[PDB]
Symmetry: D2
Subunit: 87 residues, 4 copies
């Protein structure tokens, strides 16, 4: 079956804002050298907790997220996994 | 620091050529379809695409991702696998 | 810290079912992945605990082109363990 | 068809240098990756720009993210070759 996943290494550039089954929302600033901002959505509740409990703003992370795209075109990135590299 | 995408999907366009190659992949897990525009500079891959790959091909692409600000996604191809080719 | 493998290849065995010392059921199968057809064919033995995937596989035919992601470890001769995390059926047998 | 590995781990060796069958230069090193039991993986490097990148910038103990092409070579039993395709330095030594 078709898929589309994204892997990002970057820094957490926002607070964890929470919405309504809850979800968590935050952005990663990723700068390979030009700085790319990506908004992550989180439903997996264990990860939601892991983020709120342990992870502070400015953390270097490695995130994997499932990606989707029309209305303009909008990118949804739903988190699958997170590695805290440095808090 | 990086941001890369991997996609499996079907090639949903002709290969249009600029000054690099452009094409779109329709990735449809079931059901909604996610359209991704791929940009190709790597010339060997550009040739591989034009010389072998037909529209409707199931492909596995990896691409470097960037976001240019409303916000737009650039996806520059780094690798391609042909999984199954198209009509003839 | 991690070590994961992604494979595209064909299922080159029956699905044999076993018990794991820790007392889990797991499924074993091998993927033949041959990127060249002038180069060798890499055989990789996959272990599956995730029961939904175990069922998904038993309910997949031999020779299927698959895309598998698996956690990798080395266990001691020294051997490679590849525990399945996800599977995409690209084309069946 | 493919079989790539992605590893996050620490460089656990010096960069030892060798030459190939066809007189081609390669670098060897190992990555210790410890998710939680510590997996050692031996990386082979031909891509000369990366060879330089390693020798020039990267110190032992570096946290790295490596992607490597994987192959299995049979003999006599089975051996895993991991040839580096890319490296990210996450934190140096």
């Amino acid at each position: 079956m078709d898929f589309s996943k994204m892997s990002i290494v970057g820094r957490i550039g926002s607070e964890f804002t929470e919405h309504t089954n809850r979800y968590l929302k935050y952005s990663i600033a990723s700068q390979p050298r030009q700085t790319n901002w990506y908004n992550i959505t989180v439903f997996n509740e264990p990860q939601i907790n892991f983020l709120t409990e342990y992870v502070r703003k400015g953390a270097l992370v490695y995130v994997e997220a499932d990606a989707a795209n029309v209305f303009g075109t909008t990118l949804s990135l739903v988190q699958k996994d997170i590695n805290l590299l440095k808090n």
